[PDB]
Design a protein around this ligand. Structure first.
Ligand SMILES: *[C@@H]1O[C@H](CO[C@H]2O[C@@H](C)[C@@H](O)[C@@H](O)[C@@H]2O)[C@@H](O[C@@H]2O[C@H](CO)[C@@H](O[C@@H]3O[C@H](CO[C@H]4O[C@H](CO)[C@@H](O)[C@H](O)[C@@H]4O[C@@H]4O[C@H](CO)[C@@H](O[C@@H]5O[C@H](CO)[C@H](O)[C@H](O)[C@H]5O)[C@H](O)[C@H]4NC(C)=O)[C@@H](O)[C@H](O[C@H]4O[C@H](CO)[C@@H](O)[C@H](O[C@@H]5O[C@H](CO)[C@@H](O)[C@H](O)[C@H]5NC(C)=O)[C@@H]4O)[C@@H]3O)[C@H](O)[C@H]2NC(C)=O)[C@H](O)[C@H]1NC(C)=O
Ligand SMILES: *[C@@H]1O[C@H](CO[C@@H]2O[C@@H](C)[C@@H](O)[C@@H](O)[C@@H]2O)[C@@H](O[C@@H]2O[C@H](CO)[C@@H](O[C@@H]3O[C@H](CO[C@H]4O[C@H](CO)[C@@H](O)[C@H](O)[C@@H]4O[C@@H]4O[C@H](CO)[C@@H](O)[C@H](O)[C@H]4NC(C)=O)[C@@H](O)[C@H](O[C@H]4O[C@H](CO)[C@@H](O)[C@H](O)[C@@H]4O)[C@@H]3O)[C@H](O)[C@H]2NC(C)=O)[C@H](O)[C@H]1NC(C)=O
Lengths: 207, 208
């Protein structure tokens, strides 16, 4: 019997219209001892909002029990602590797990778009690059668009700790060479708490 | 009870015959009651006898740690042989077996591209030189930067990322003083991977 606690998605905390949530997952619940119990706290003050999702019977004859707590955007971004407490018959003592946003002064990301290398122009597809550096903490969302429509053939690296204590990442969008050569505009969109309106975009085109 | 961890060789050690690649079997949580541990090693299921076992080390939590190292042949690892470490201890009901090998699949040659700093970044005192490596399989790779034949210090590389075609990509970022870039120095990104000729390639970047 083990307990894991998961933070909300960055995009959910940065847009007021979306619903962020903390997730508490209990694994390795035996058939002999069901009836896992959940206690949730926020800065020590107990809350009663959580919902217990239906459990799954797994392939190795165990169960996974999930509890979800909805959180306010300003609570999470202010640094409040969330504690999940799990009690089962098989456990000797209740298990406590805690999570919160990383502490420290937030730092604004710098966004740079880089066109394909000239050597890549011999291929059928080319890579468009979006470098995002200098940001803190590491919670961030990156998306690509063109003509106001989302592009989907992109992949983003995990954040990497840089030598000055900030984070950086790269996002790579793959497009057909003919779309690049015709002059279409491609945009890298970045969402982070230290940005004005939590959002900025940078464009790239051959022109 | 004891736990067993098996570690692969470092990518640079398998790619240069002058270096020595090694597989490491590490056993933790050996009790003070039953400290005797036995190792058996197999390569493709055939037992080998040239492994080197270090003396047990007492930890501050009243347990022992034991390490056994097997030196491997470069061609054996690159040909996909499987290495098994088996650990026997009287506190166990059965021996513990762990297996490791190179990732399965056909190797694919990396494409290496260097990208100069963005124009918007030239207002800064430091600039970023970018090395993109894409299309490679498997993900075991080594990336380094140098200038004028001497290694550069201030770079960081992302972990490999699985792309949409089943191959991997990564980026490496070198941070340099703007003055060094604007004076026409040559910077070079070097890459080591099994699918490259001589396991090595290099690509340069300069103002010009
Ligand atoms: C019997 O079967 C059990 C279950 O069946 C599964 O078995 C598996 C082996 C597998 O084969 C499956 O086929 C099968 O279904 C099985 O139980 C295992 O146990 C594993 C460990 O023993 C456990 O692995 C851990 O996984 C977590 C992360 O798990 C998430 O990611 C995986 C993919 O990596 C997903 O598959 C999984 O479903 C989890 O999903 C994430 O969580 C939620 C819900 O999905 C998402 O969050 C929400 O998402 C919604 C949208 O869906 C909203 O967005 C919402 O807002 C969100 O909140 C989240 O997005 C999901 N993520 C992804 C990517 O999808 C890892 O964290 C573990 O890694 C640990 O590694 C080290 C080494 O131990 C640990 O030290 C470390 O711990 C912490 O690390 C911190 C670092 O900062 C540190 O600060 C802490 O101190 C430290 N703490 C401790 C105590 O160390 C990491 O935690 C680990 O890999 C499996 O997940 C689990 N199965 C399942 C299904 O969960 C049994 O093992 C098996 N055998 C037996 C004998 O019983
Ligand atoms: C008693 O104490 C032991 C020693 O710990 C010391 O004392 C305690 C009090 C602490 O202060 C420690 O910090 C201190 O070191 C404990 O041993 C540890 O046990 C845990 C498991 O219980 C081991 O965790 C496993 O670690 C794997 C990676 O380990 C590498 O990296 C470590 C740093 O991150 C490093 O310390 C290790 O030595 C090891 O280093 C590699 O060694 C090889 C060969 O020598 C080299 O080739 C590599 O280059 C080295 N790498 C680096 C980065 O240097 C993890 O991979 C592993 O996770 C895997 O399995 C888990 C499931 O268990 C999966 O969830 C996961 O996804 C992954 O697949 C696992 O976490 C730890 O390594 C042990 N420490 C040492 C030093 O051996 C005892 O646990 C403790 N016992 C009790 C009862 O308290």
């Amino acid at each position: 019997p083990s307990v894991f606690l998961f933070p909300p998605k960055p995009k959910d905390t940065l847009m007021i219209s979306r619903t962020p949530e903390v997730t508490c997952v209990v694994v390795d619940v035996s058939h002999e001892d069901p009836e896992v119990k959940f206690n949730w706290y926020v800065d020590g003050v107990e809350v009663h909002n959580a919902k217990t999702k239906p459990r799954e019977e797994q392939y190795n004859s165990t169960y996974r029990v999930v509890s979800v707590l909805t959180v306010l955007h300003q609570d999470w971004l202010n640094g409040k602590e969330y504690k999940c407490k799990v009690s089962n018959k098989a456990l000797p003592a209740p298990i406590e797990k805690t999570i919160s946003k990383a502490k420290g002064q937030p730092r604004e990301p710098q966004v740079y778009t880089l066109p394909p290398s000239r050597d890549e122009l011999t291929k059928n597809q080319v890579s468009l690059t979006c470098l995002v550096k200098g940001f803190y903490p590491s919670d961030i969302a990156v998306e690509w668009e063109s003509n106001g429509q989302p592009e989907n053939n992109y992949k983003t690296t995990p954040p990497v700790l840089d030598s000055d204590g900030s984070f950086f990442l790269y996002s790579k969008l793959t497009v057909d060479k003919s779309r690049w050569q015709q002059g279409n505009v491609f945009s890298c969109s970045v969402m982070h708490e230290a940005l004005h309106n939590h959002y900025t975009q940078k464009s790239l085109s051959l022109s």
